[PDB]
Design a binder for these strands. Structure first.
Lengths: 63, 47, 125
RNA sequence: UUCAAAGCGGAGAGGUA
């Protein structure tokens, strides 16, 4: 996991979008949902921050 | 945002050539490769 | 106006620094009470008219100072701040407190050059 | 059970970017 990889992934998410202001809202919703669902006291990969986790998951879904 | 091989610039490199190279990189490769290229050029010039 | 929007503040040496609205309200109330007292005793009319004119000038100076007649000066020879001066200027409420404010979780310092940093990175003390 | 004692407005003069 590197910051450069995150930068490239975010750029790839911006493309394939048709709107720049509509992807930020989706990322924020996914991040809030992930952090809230983390409330189970198991600490599933709590190391990563919610926004970076949402970016990684949405990039993986892009295939 | 790939597949375009750079041309071997066999000439002197002033500010105009650097601006042209940055523009070409943005037009052909994207917005995250231009930052890397600019950082590499900065390091080489400072050295 | 409610009293917390025209508060009384205490200086370092124990002296009070009252607002400019309190003086204008005091003048209006004093003139009103005096005129009512004169009207009670059935005073001659030529003095009641003087009291009425003075009350008009006082209320006018409270609403807007120095618009029609003469400016009302306070302790020094500087004008008092009326109700219209609160909202109207460049330092009024609109441009100073509503279109831009002070915020929390903020700082300020001098900047130096950092090489060996990547763009999108900064160095915070 | 209660908090709690440190924050204050205006005017003038000069300076840094």
């Amino acid at each position: 996991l590197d910051s450069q990889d995150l930068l490239f992934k975010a750029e790839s998410l911006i493309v394939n979008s048709t709107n720049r202001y509509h992807v930020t809202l989706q990322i924020a919703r996914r991040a809030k949902q992930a952090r809230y669902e983390e409330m189970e006291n198991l600490s599933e990969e709590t190391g990563i921050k919610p926004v970076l986790r949402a970016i990684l998951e949405m990039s993986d879904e892009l295939n | 945002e790939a597949k375009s091989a750079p041309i071997f610039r066999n000439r002197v490199i002033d500010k105009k050539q650097l601006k042209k190279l940055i523009g070409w990189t943005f037009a052909h490769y994207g917005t995250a490769k231009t930052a890397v290229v600019a950082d590499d050029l900065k390091a080489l010039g400072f050295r | 106006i409610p009293p917390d929007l025209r508060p009384m503040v205490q200086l370092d040496g124990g002296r009070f620094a009252t607002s400019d609205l309190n003086d204008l309200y005091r003048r209006v109330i004093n003139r009103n009470n005096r005129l009512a007292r004169l009207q009670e005793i059935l005073a001659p009319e030529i003095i009641v008219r003087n009291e009425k004119r003075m009350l008009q000038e006082a209320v006018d100076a409270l609403i807007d100072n120095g618009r029609r007649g003469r400016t009302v000066v306070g302790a020094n020879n500087r004008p008092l701040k009326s109700l219209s001066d609160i909202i109207e200027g460049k330092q009024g409420r609109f441009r100073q407190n509503l279109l831009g404010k002070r915020v929390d979780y903020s700082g300020r310092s001098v900047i130096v050059v950092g090489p060996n940093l990547k763009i999108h990175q900064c160095g915070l003390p």
